[PDB]
Amino acid sequence: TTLLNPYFGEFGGMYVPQILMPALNQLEEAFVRAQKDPEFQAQFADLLKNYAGRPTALTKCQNITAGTRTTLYLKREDLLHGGAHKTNQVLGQALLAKRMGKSEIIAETGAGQHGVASALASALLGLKCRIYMGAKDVERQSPNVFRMRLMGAEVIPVHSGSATLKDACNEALRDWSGSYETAHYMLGTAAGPHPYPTIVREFQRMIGEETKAQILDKEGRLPDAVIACVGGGSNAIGMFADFINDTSVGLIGVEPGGHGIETGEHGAPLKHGRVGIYFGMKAPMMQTADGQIEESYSISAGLDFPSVGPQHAYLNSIGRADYVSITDDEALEAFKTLCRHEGIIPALESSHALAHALKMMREQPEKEQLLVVNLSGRGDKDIFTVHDIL
Amino acid sequence: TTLLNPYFGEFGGMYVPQILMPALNQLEEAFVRAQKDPEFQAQFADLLKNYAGRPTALTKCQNITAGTRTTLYLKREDLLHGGAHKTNQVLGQALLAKRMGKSEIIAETGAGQHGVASALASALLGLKCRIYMGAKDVERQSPNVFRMRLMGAEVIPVHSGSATLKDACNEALRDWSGSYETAHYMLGTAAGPHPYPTIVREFQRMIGEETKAQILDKEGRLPDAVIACVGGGSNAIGMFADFINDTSVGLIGVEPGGHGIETGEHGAPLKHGRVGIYFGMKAPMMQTADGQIEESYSISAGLDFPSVGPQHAYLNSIGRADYVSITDDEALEAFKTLCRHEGIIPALESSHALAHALKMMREQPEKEQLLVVNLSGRGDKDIFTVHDIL
Amino acid sequence: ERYENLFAQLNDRREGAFVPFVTLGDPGIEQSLKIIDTLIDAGADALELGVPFSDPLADGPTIQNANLRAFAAGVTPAQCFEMLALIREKHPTIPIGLLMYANLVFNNGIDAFYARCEQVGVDSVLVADVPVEESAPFRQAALRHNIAPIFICPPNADDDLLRQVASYGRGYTYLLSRSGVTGAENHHLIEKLKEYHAAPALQGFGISSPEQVSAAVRAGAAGAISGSAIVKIIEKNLASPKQMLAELRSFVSAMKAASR
Amino acid sequence: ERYENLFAQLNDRREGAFVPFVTLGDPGIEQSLKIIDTLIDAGADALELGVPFSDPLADGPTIQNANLRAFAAGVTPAQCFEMLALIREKHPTIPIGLLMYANLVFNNGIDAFYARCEQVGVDSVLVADVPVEESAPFRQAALRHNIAPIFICPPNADDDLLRQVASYGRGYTYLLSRSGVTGAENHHLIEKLKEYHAAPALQGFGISSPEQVSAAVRAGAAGAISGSAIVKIIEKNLASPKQMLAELRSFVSAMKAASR
Numbered sequence A, B: 001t002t003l004l005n006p007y008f009g010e011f012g013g014m015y016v017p018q019i020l021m022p023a024l025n026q027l028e029e030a031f032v033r034a035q036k037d038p039e040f041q042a043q044f045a046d047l048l049k050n051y052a053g054r055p056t057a058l059t060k061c062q063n064i065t066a067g068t069r070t071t072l073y074l075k076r077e078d079l080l081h082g083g084a085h086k087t088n089q090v091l092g093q094a095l096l097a098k099r100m101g102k103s104e105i106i107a108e109t110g111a112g113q114h115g116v117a118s119a120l121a122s123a124l125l126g127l128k129c130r131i132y133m134g135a136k137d138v139e140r141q142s143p144n145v146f147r148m149r150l151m152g153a154e155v156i157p158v159h160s161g162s163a164t165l166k167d168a169c170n171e172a173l174r175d176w177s178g179s180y181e182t183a184h185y186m187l188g189t190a191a192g193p194h195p196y197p198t199i200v201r202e203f204q205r206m207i208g209e210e211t212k213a214q215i216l217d218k219e220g221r222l223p224d225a226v227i228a229c230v231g232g233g234s235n236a237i238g239m240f241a242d243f244i245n246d247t248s249v250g251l252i253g254v255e256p257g258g259h260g261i262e263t264g265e266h267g268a269p270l271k272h273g274r275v276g277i278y279f280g281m282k283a284p285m286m287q288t289a290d291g292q293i294e295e296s297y298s299i300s301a302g303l304d305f306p307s308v309g310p311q312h313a314y315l316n317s318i319g320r321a322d323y324v325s326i327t328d329d330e331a332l333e334a335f336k337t338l339c340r341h342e343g344i345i346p347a348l349e350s351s352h353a354l355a356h357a358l359k360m361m362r363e364q365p366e367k368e369q370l371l372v373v374n375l376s377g378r379g380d381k382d383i384f385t386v387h388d389i390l
Numbered sequence C, D: 001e002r003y004e005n006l007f008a009q010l011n012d013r014r015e016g017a018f019v020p021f022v023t024l025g026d027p028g029i030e031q032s033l034k035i036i037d038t039l040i041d042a043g044a045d046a047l048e049l050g051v052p053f054s055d056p057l058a059d060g061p062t063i064q065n066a067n068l069r070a071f072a073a074g075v076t077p078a079q080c081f082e083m084l085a086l087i088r089e090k091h092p093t094i095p096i097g098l099l100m101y102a103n104l105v106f107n108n109g110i111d112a113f114y115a116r117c118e119q120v121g122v123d124s125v126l127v128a129d130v131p132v133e134e135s136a137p138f139r140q141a142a143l144r145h146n147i148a149p150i151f152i153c154p155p156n157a158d159d160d161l162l163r164q165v166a167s168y169g170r171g172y173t174y175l176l177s178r179s180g181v182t183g184a185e186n187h188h189l190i191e192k193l194k195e196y197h198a199a200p201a202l203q204g205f206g207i208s209s210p211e212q213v214s215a216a217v218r219a220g221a222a223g224a225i226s227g228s229a230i231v232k233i234i235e236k237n238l239a240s241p242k243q244m245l246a247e248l249r250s251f252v253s254a255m256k257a258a259s260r
């Protein structure tokens, strides 16, 4: 038995080899006590504030919405140490690891951002960091790899399977099944076996709590909708969490549509995949008709998770949240538009969220709406990519 | 005559062609009134807070100083929108430009960071941006150039002279001498003709004001010394300003020593150059025995200004502030050390400041000292550079 | 049924069971079927067969490569069930157990997967990524179709788990010799399992030498499962089918010999 | 002295002064001296000579290139003063004005630069980046060494500036025809300057056509200065010294002719 519910409706669970259950049970228990431990919270908040840079600003866009009745605010997680929202949760999981007496950290990474965040939190807190990365990604993410090494993290390429993120996720679990005693698996998104979906959300929840207080302060009211891209689901659920009970606030998740849904080359498992059991959870995913797991495709490398967090699949099923997709080209246009009119280079990941807000505005220009887009990260990393395409 | 003193002791002045004096006088006057205008301040502070990310954190280093009696804090300007402290001042100069009815912006840039900051402030405030860059730098700063273009700024290469920063500074003044009526010259450092040294300092002054309140809060006392690298002098004077009257606080400026002072290949004009008249000011600079201006050399491209701000030359002469140098290798070691023990990638520029703090600590480990280093920027931009060297 | 029978017989002959594991379709369909016929001829008491899955997270390199070779051969779950039927048609009494990953079982409906196992003649199913806590739907479907749901007893097993594995499992109990994943180059439980009337224990993971089989049986286990050690012989002889079967016969006979 | 004399003479002959400007040492020492002798022979009333500086921020492309050519020739300030002496030795009466940038004057001491100008026979010095507000040290040093400190009267000049330029300047007043920098392809003041007893005005910047000289004199100016237009002839004939001098003679004579 567990202390917390491992399922969100029919999605979730703990589908891991029997050998790992005690590790999972130990983690849930450590999390539940840390959550009630004032000393743990003070420590977490201290690092978020004095080391990461929280609270991040909530910027009102004054040029981009000209000529419409849309007021758009951007939650600036791009201003967080590391350049992305991932930093919030790895700092918490690292404190959790220490609380359990663990001295090593295992992490999986695709685009490399989670790897970098895991490495920086480890270096800061004196933990040994082991990072698994698909050989194909290692090759395409040379900069992030050097960054990880520079921070003392060990980067191990994974040549098995497709040699991408899903294969790195496999290797991390394999490693952990044998080293759970001294090492902690720092999962990178709000997915996987319980209690990770729950832990990662609670450690990303300050994004939505800050936004709410910030919008209430600047506009005297809650937004009509908050929008966030969904790769695995952490930045999105982090933004959604505090608004879930405010039924008047729309929650919109944007999955990458790649070259277009109809082309089959996308990364939108939540709305265009099929429920399966993988990576320790029951959730919708990219899989063949045979049940073999497939990769997610997108112009932005950071939305490569072939599945999605269970709480999202759940929020969708009960109609609390809506999920849409945005193609590469639409994300590109949103990327260019923000650079040119607001002087902010957004991550191609976050551009998917921005592109949808832009669409809501443009399709109904006279509609009065207060929107908040979660700018999950900065796009310096995407400069060359957008360069060549252009 | 002018409203403010154009000189700091014997350094400073307004050594520009006669045709530009009225532009200078108009700017000083606009600055003096803006400085007294509550509406202007509210606007400036608003942008700094909700758009740039101020106040930046003051991080206590807990690993790097282990085994010594040195307490080291880092002022995180690396967490500022844009990744560097330059953002603070360009936002203010942009508001100044609008206040004067100017609609265009002229800027010079070497490493490209000032160009990027000028471009982002222009895009945000609806100003047309023209940026001059030495052809040699354009070539070596491909990423920053694309960033500038991406933000709608015009980047014009300068093939004259050495085709580096000093030549770009020349072209900007040439351009301005003929377009001062509709355009404003957004100088990138606390140097040049009055009132730029004064304006840039006042627009960077929040760095030191924040630090003081932050240190007083965390340590209950003022630091023993605050340290900052000096390329042209803006991040340094921004940090120093608020502490100048607190005589118990040491002010230390670090110029790049390149391959070593004795090799002649450095960028430390303040302590190893000779007073000359150039770029509209009387200050120490890199020049031949003949009086021809020379380039500053350093592993970090952002410390390429062949001279130094006049207030620094002045603070040094009266012994209020001390200036030292740090070689490429020392900056490199400091760069690696911060990545590995604190999980922060510093700009190679800021690493010069860090390297000196490290030296103060290491040379006298039992000396009790409270130090603050101004982490002027992040080093993502330096990853490949440090890569190859390594 | 088939497990009960096999175990009754082995007990009378005072010997342990040797169970080889191979991936269906490795290195190809025709060669895989030949490999399997050789394993049985050489002395295997039962078979543990894996269905090629894209993300075998409980498997070490050796078997990860076996899956790749299988996929490279165009092998699909449907083709596996075809092989499974042909194998059963040739060997009516040997117990056949499948080593599965959850998605391949869940894919087209849980009950439908077991119904297919039943009609093909499969005896047991071990779902590697389904712990006892999440097994309800799986074991019930297995029972409804007369398939034995196999459960893993890990070394870090506490009493509660022991009791569950004992009452939920059937056919045999998979006993983990260590933590980690499958890999050739890598008692209190046995007694407690017996105490709780658990199905005969078969030890697995790392069993590559004949003496390991002797020791397993001596420790109280009904037999041993060996996979990577067998699969390694396949990969090392890819270029020569003949030598592959010869070496397979030799290894298997030596391993079964040790079970007596 | 030399300016006073030149201007007295020109007034009697009812003509304006034509003053060419070239960079000392462009394209080389020997050729530069020849170019200068040709300018005088062709009709120049005075010379405005630039000393190659590394950062000529008040200069357009044409002259920026002249400095480069000079540096490429190894020309230094010391060599310029050597040329300056040879030129004076050959032409005892022509006024010689130097176009300088502040650092080259400040370098080894302000007073020392003017002392050297005096001993070499230089008549005036125009420091391009020193406005009247910062000129105290410079004009005083100039006066002490009998050198005329030249000041620029820009088009956006207000009355106060006018009065200062009038009382501080000597020899001649440099009148800016426009804002911006030097470049060939690019009255109220004149009266006020006369009212305030300013030294004879010489208009400069953009003067490249003979009619421009006529118009300048007609407007009330004592003459015109032309630089880029002259330097352009040098760069365009680099490969042929002979044609360079020929074309220089032609342009200069045409320009001086227009001053009458």
Ligand SMILES: O=P(O)(O)OCCCc1c[nH]c2ccc(F)cc12
Binding pocket: C021, C048, C050, C058, C059, C063, C099, C128, C152, C181, C182, C183, C184, C204, C205, C206, C207, C225, C226, C227, C228, C229
């Ligand atoms: O000889 P070895 O170590 O390859 O064991 C193979 C055992 C059979 C086996 C193959 N794949 C597995 C995945 C999970 C599991 F519990 C058991 C197995």
Ligand SMILES: O=P(O)(O)OCCCc1c[nH]c2ccc(F)cc12
Binding pocket: D021, D048, D050, D058, D059, D063, D099, D128, D152, D181, D182, D183, D184, D204, D205, D206, D207, D225, D226, D227, D228, D229
């Ligand atoms: O013909 P043109 O436009 O090249 O003018 C040349 C005038 C002489 C000249 C050469 N360099 C200068 C720098 C400043 C200044 F006030 C005047 C000059």
Ligand SMILES: *Cc1c(COP(=O)(O)O)cnc(C)c1O
Binding pocket: A084, A085, A086, A113, A114, A188, A189, A190, A229, A230, A231, A232, A233, A234, A235, A236, A302, A303, A347, A349, A350, A376, A377, A378
């Ligand atoms: C990691 C990342 C994402 C995707 O992860 P989620 O878990 O879906 O939040 C999105 N944006 C940025 C900038 C990221 O780094």
Ligand SMILES: *Cc1c(COP(=O)(O)O)cnc(C)c1O
Binding pocket: B084, B085, B086, B113, B114, B188, B189, B190, B229, B230, B231, B232, B233, B234, B235, B236, B302, B303, B347, B349, B350, B376, B377, B378
């Ligand atoms: C521009 C820059 C500097 C140098 O400029 P100063 O005017 O000397 O402050 C130093 N550090 C960083 C990161 C910079 O971008």
Ligand code: NA
Binding pocket: A230, A231, A232, A267, A268, A269, A296, A303, A304, A305, A306, A307, A308
């Ligand atoms: Na996904």
Ligand code: NA
Binding pocket: B230, B231, B232, B267, B268, B269, B296, B303, B304, B305, B306, B307, B308
């Ligand atoms: Na400098």
